[PDB]
């Protein structure tokens, strides 16, 4: 039995494409409370947040879009996951642009000083706001929350509140394949660990597994904190998605991430952000996208692929 | 061609089973198999074949449901006692006997057909275990049931059911191993786990592979002694995306070239004895193509049971033209 | 930095199926020439090649389709390599059906009699004129240039030209999964190793690369040409292709084939044909296959997944 709260963050000023506010609701309507129910998990119903809107928020620096109205959703979203982790909940939150695991991380660590982090993406969203090309806050949530970042990254208007509260050797990627020059640098200048799609072709999905908890947990028991962008997973199984990259996850793999993370007990936190559904072509690509994060979550939560989570006793006898 | 790097002989029956499920049209299984060119690919890999037809099947007119449950129990039973006997008749003839789907109860005949090979061995690959008993089912269909009519350890979980009193268990629990796991009812998970039956679920296929996975399937079947071989092969075992005319699909499934492979490793053991290829249904595809590419599919899959590689090879060519 | 050559073959001839001598349009739309720009590539396009017509070109041995017309635009075609690999430029062709590798590795052996070959292809493409079921010259170019397979070519109208270069030990595939029986006696006979589908499906990709650099450049350092037909690609990811075969490469084993290749330093040359829009049922799947041809020139050229391939060593400071 797992306690678990949901949290719905209808979110879109982390980038440019609209209709990934509406990505909680698809979430749900797939069947989540539902799901988590049949696998046994007490859970809590936060809603869907109304984020404080800001009028005022224009273009800064010719270069971050949308900052003041970033910066505040998250420090609201902060507040949220920290009741929800302080009551002893494993915090589940449905995004939403990924620019809220700033949000997220922030909130959680305000209760778990020793927490890691698993961020699986086809990106590594840790371009500062000064390596940055589009400026799109989504592909730059990383570069708050590291602490050896924190002098390369500019205090940007909305930001003050939010405090670097993760080491380099503390965040583990899985999925990589469209990474920034700039990302690059910081990935291998930073010894930050990263296990990209290549990595996985080489490797296998499972010494992938055993080798980021070996450089996360190894040395002793930790909260985790899953950051799953939706877009980790192949455009062809996720296609309501706002920055699609071909050559990602296979249904199997992304199953097999969340089902090894189950297996640690430690998980603590997951953000399940990107889902799109607007972006889909027709209805059932958007219904796919949806379905295919209720997978995640489940798996994250007990779900397995050998039919062990609901318990039997005894076989009837004749 | 007059040349091959071997001659089988195949016998291929035609079983349109429907009466072990609720879902319409998997009778019509062996037609869309023998459509896609079953018989031609067969003889062009130098088979000699001996096609027994497509079986008649009459539904018993006053068969009533066992414990409200258990749909069509004399009918299923009666089916695989026939079944049994022509399939015995294939094996003791020096066939290789291929079964053409139809739903998977039809190997509760196939197996004790084969058995009557008494040291047998089985390879279920599926995306289930169909290993409930009719007490544990929640459906009631046979086809989620026949290993547990065929296992001899379970012997004491399984009520007699009405025309089934024919059906002596063959297999030991240690005789069959599962390939392409992903969709298991609790308490067929319980019988994998408490009667040690072995399996590589779609988990331990994405963390071994299928070469190491069909090296640790031979290990535990055919390793002690050379044993003849049944695969029992459920369509459903592939993903939805290559084979999507079938009755219950599952997600996460066996890529073409894993399928391809466990077939292929089933023929370099030269110990194939018989080959079901069941859950075709060409009216659950939602077109032609989709139809077309399961029923391709199934063929690919009989066709490398007997040879037909990646790499070619099947066929001896002599000497090369010279100018 | 790499001086790269774009010759627009537009062949057709080596085949029936009408289309594919727009296919070096198609990759160029999609945007090829920007795409190797930014990885820092000096660039000359020769456009697409106008090949002189025979309209007098019967039939040899009332089997062999346009023996003349293949012939020639072949002998025109190698002269434009011999001048590219001259010139200092690695050279791409684009194709065009895949008999176009006589004139590519024709003018290529020409400067680089040391150069070993990477056929990455569903097919062995090594039918003599005298075992061609089909009489399409698509699936008979490597009968051609193999020094060992002399004696059982007969001399073609228009191939007289033609030099056997490439010795059996210098050529490996990649991708076989539909082997003639007289293309597997020539590959088992004269000792011609192979990676097929089950050697991957066994192997790994990683595996594979290792073994074949071990065979071609496992004494001594030599050109590298890269022969890629699209059609070694599953149908799925490239559908877009006159003779597709089920169970091929994914896009993550293509692109690792080329980022191997690219990370010996090695390539000289590349091929990548049988690219024919016409063939793909919607506007999207002619796209897709021409996005991935486009990816492989890409990988090949430098383009990682992981983002490395341009200079980076000093982030900006706020
Ligand atoms: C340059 C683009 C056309 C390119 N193909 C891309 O995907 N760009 C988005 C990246 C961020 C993606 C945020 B995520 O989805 O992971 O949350 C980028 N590195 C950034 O900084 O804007
Ligand atoms: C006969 C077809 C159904 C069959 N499955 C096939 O693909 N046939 C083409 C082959 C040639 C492939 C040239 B390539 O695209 O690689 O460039 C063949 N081996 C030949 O010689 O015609
Ligand atoms: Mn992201
Ligand atoms: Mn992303
Ligand atoms: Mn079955
Ligand atoms: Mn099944
Ligand atoms: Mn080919
Ligand atoms: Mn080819």
């Given at each position: 039995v797992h306690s678990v709260a949901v949290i719905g963050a209808p979110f879109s000023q982390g980038q440019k494409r609209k209709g990934v506010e509406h990505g909680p609701a698809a979430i749900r309507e797939a069947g989540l409370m539902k799901r988590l129910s049949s696998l046994g998990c007490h859970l809590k119903d936060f809603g869907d947040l109304s984020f404080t809107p800001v009028p005022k928020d224009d273009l800064y620096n010719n270069?971050?879009?949308?900052?003041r109205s970033v910066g505040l959703?998250?420090?609201?979203?902060?507040?949220?996951?920290?009741?929800?982790?302080?009551?002893?909940?494993?915090?589940?939150?449905?995004g939403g642009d990924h620019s809220l695991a700033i949000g997220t991380i922030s909130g959680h660590?305000?209760?778990?000083?020793?927490?890691?982090?698993?961020?699986?993406?086809?990106?590594?969203?840790?371009?500062?706001?000064?390596?940055?090309?589009?400026?799109?806050?989504?592909?730059?949530?990383?570069?708050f929350l590291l602490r050896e970042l924190q002098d390369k990254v500019?205090?940007?208007?909305?930001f003050s509140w939010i405090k670097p509260c993760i080491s380099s050797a503390s965040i583990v990627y899985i999925g990589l394949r469209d990474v920034d020059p700039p990302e690059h640098f910081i990935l291998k200048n930073y010894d930050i660990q990263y296990f990209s799609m290549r990595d996985i072709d080489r490797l296998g999905i499972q010494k992938?597994?055993?080798?980021?908890?070996?450089?996360?947990?190894?040395?002793?028991?930790?909260?985790?904190?899953?950051?799953?962008?939706?877009?980790?997973?192949?455009?062809?199984?996720?296609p309501a998605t706002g920055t699609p990259v071909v050559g990602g996850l296979t249904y199997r793999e992304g199953m097999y991430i969340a089902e090894e993370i189950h297996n640690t007990g430690?998980?603590?936190?997951l953000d399940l952000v990107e889902v799109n559904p607007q972006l889909a072509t027709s209805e059932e690509e958007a219904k796919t996208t949806a379905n295919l994060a209720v997978d995640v979550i489940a798996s994250s939560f007990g779900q397995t692929r050998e039919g062990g989570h609901i318990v039997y006793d005894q076989l009837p006898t004749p």
């Open positions: 270069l971050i879009v949308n900052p959703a998250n420090q609201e979203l902060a507040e949220v996951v920290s009741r929800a982790v302080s009551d002893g909940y494993s915090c589940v939150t449905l660590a305000r209760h778990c000083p020793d927490l890691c982090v698993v961020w699986v993406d086809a990106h590594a969203d840790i371009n500062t706001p000064l390596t940055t090309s589009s400026g799109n806050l989504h592909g730059q949530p990383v570069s500019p205090q940007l208007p909305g992938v597994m055993e080798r980021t908890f070996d450089l996360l947990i190894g040395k002793r028991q930790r909260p985790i904190h899953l950051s799953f962008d939706i877009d980790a997973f192949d455009p062809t199984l996720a430690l998980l603590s936190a």
